Amino acid sequence: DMYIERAGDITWEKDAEVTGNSPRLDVALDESGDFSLVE
Amino acid sequence: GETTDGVYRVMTRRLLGSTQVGVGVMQEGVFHTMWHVTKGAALRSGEGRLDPYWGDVKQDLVSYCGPWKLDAAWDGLSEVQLLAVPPGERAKNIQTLPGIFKTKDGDIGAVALDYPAGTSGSPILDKCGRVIGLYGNGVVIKNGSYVSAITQGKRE
Numbered sequence: 001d002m003y004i005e006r007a008g009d010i011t012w013e014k015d016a017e018v019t020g021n022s023p024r025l026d027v028a029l030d031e032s033g034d035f036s037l038v039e
Numbered sequence: 040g041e042t043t044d045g046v047y048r049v050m051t052r053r054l055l056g057s058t059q060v061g062v063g064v065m066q067e068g069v070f071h072t073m074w075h076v077t078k079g080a081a082l083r084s085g086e087g088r089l090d091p092y093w094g095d096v097k098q099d100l101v102s103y104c105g106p107w108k109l110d111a112a113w114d115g116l117s118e119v120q121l122l123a124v125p126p127g128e129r130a131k132n133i134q135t136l137p138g139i140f141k142t143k144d145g146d147i148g149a150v151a152l153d154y155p156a157g158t159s160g161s162p163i164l165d166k167c168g169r170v171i172g173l174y175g176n177g178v179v180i181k182n183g184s185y186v187s188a189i190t191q192g193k194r195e
């Protein structure tokens with residue numbers, strides 16, 4: 001049996017670590033929910 | 040059991056040690072997680088039991104105790120925050136500007152942040168702390184790295 005454990009509050013934090021680019025991709029979603037990169 | 044609003048860890052005692060299979064969000068008495076984490080199975084919270092209410096494999100979402108409550112969405116312009124809860128590590132807010140998943144059915148948001156697969160189900164926050172989607176389902180790009188979508192369900 002799986003179980004849950006609290007790990008924090010849902011809050012926006014000022015002065016947070018900023019990382020990560022903004023890519024625009026062409027993808028396809030299947031009946032199984034798996035995203036595949038379309039080219 | 041405990042139904043306090045916030046972010047939770049989805050754990051299993053089925054393997055060696057206590058492995059963290061995913062993450063979820065409690066809001067208005069509903070546990071919101073990605074389907075691929077729990078596989079639609081019932082969870083436990085203290086002595087209490089969380090039984091599923093709604094789920095969809097294509098959307099990769101599942102809600103417990105009640106219908107999906109999260110209804111906010113990315114504005115396509117503003118920076119967001121992934122409140123990442125990684126396995127064996129403390130919750131961490133990571134600010135980023137989202138990308139785009141251009142599909143035949145519509146454009147969806149995206150986050151190019153790579154975390155261990157046990158982080159699946161971590162919320163994505165707007166400037167008010169409103170949950171606009173969940174991290175953990177996306178695609179692998181030519182870089183080898185992962186780009187997850189901002190997955191959000193419908194409120195009725």
Ligand SMILES: COc1cc(Cc2ccnc(N3CCNCC3)c2)nc(N2CCNCC2)n1
Nearest residue numbers: 032033034075099153154155156159175179185
């Ligand atoms: C390369 O793919 C993945 C997938 C996932 C999550 C996952 C795993 C298994 N099956 C899934 N599904 C949901 C949709 N279709 C049905 C099956 C989903 N996680 C990561 N990660 C690798 C490290 N970085 C982030 C997590 N990669």
